[PDB]
Structure 1
């Protein structure tokens, strides 16, 4: 299975200055629960943003840099390399990866951040005409998690 994993806001913002525009611990927990034991494929910028591979899953980085050889990270140099990765593969970002993959993936696990943030990077437009809502779950709010959010699982019709 090949899936997208993304958090985007009401206007599809995903990032600002190479980081998330929001602080939302529960989204990171969501990411952990979905991708632990599986494979993440991410662009080079997203990798440098996190700074180190995420534990307990396969971290795959897409880059043109032939000198890229980082401990605990597997490197690929082509989109086509993605299709040879075994198991459940999550396209993990960022904008460039999402743009390249949205037409190719089986499904998407989206965290809709129900606010409007300043962004410099965006998830591409998509329409519910193309995507069945397999589930929609409101995130729970508290002192640490104060931005309303909804976890959507969309499956291509």
Structure 2
């Protein structure tokens, strides 16, 4: 199973100066629920921005640096190596990798942040003509989750 796992805002911003533009604890738990026990693939810049691999799942980093090695991180150097990964595999970031992968994945788990942030990293444009809406669930606003957001699970037609 090959999926995209992304959060972007109303203009597809997914990042600004190595950071998430928004603090949204509910989306983290959403990420933890979907990806625990499975595989996360990410480009080198996405990984360095987190700074440590995420617990209780396989962390795979794509890079051309043959010296790259991090404890708890499996390295690949080829787009093609992604397809040799066993199990449910999530493309986690960033813009470059999504651009390479958005035409290959079976489905996408998008968190739409109903806001307009300043960004420098973008999720690629996509149209609903090509994706069926398997589910659309609004996140709940509260104390710590203060921006409207929506979980989409889109499947390719």
* Fold conserved between structures, TM > 0.5: yes
Residues in 1 aligned to 2:65 and 2:146: alpha-carbon distance in whole angstroms: 39
Task: Write out per-residue CA displacement over residues 98-151 of structure 1, whole angstroms, 9 at most, x where no aligned residue.
Answer: 000000000000000000000001000000000000000000111100000000
By how many angstroms is 1:70 displaced?
0.8
1:19 CA displacement: 1.0
Unaligned runs of 5+ in 2: none
Distance 2:127 2:11 in 1: 13
- Please report the TM-score for the alignment, with normalisation by the length of structure 2: 0.99
Structure 1 residues 44-94: Cα deviation after superposition (integer angstroms, max 9, x where no partner): 111111111000000000011100111100000010000000000000001
TM-superposed CA distance for 1:32, in Å, is: 0.3
**TM-score for the superposition, normalised by structure 1:** 0.99
Secondary structure, aligned partner of 1:129 = helix
The structural deviation recorded for 1:13 is 0.5
User: 1:2-151 counterparts in 2 under 5 A?
Assistant: 2-151=2-151
| SS of match in other structure, 1:71 | coil
- Kindly state the Cα deviation for residue 5 of structure 1 after the two structures are TM-superposed: 0.2
| Structure 1 segments unaligned to the other structure (5+ residues) | none
Partners in 2 of 1:113 and 1:105 — Cα distance?
22
**1:49 counterpart SS class:** helix
Q: State the Cα distance separating 1:10 from its structure 2 match.
A: 0.3
Root mean square deviation, CA, Å = 0.4
Runs of 4+ in structure 1 deviating by more than 2 angstroms, as ranges, are none
2 CA distance for matches of 1:100 and 1:110? 17
CA offsets, 1:10-32, max 9 Å, x none?
00000000110111111111100
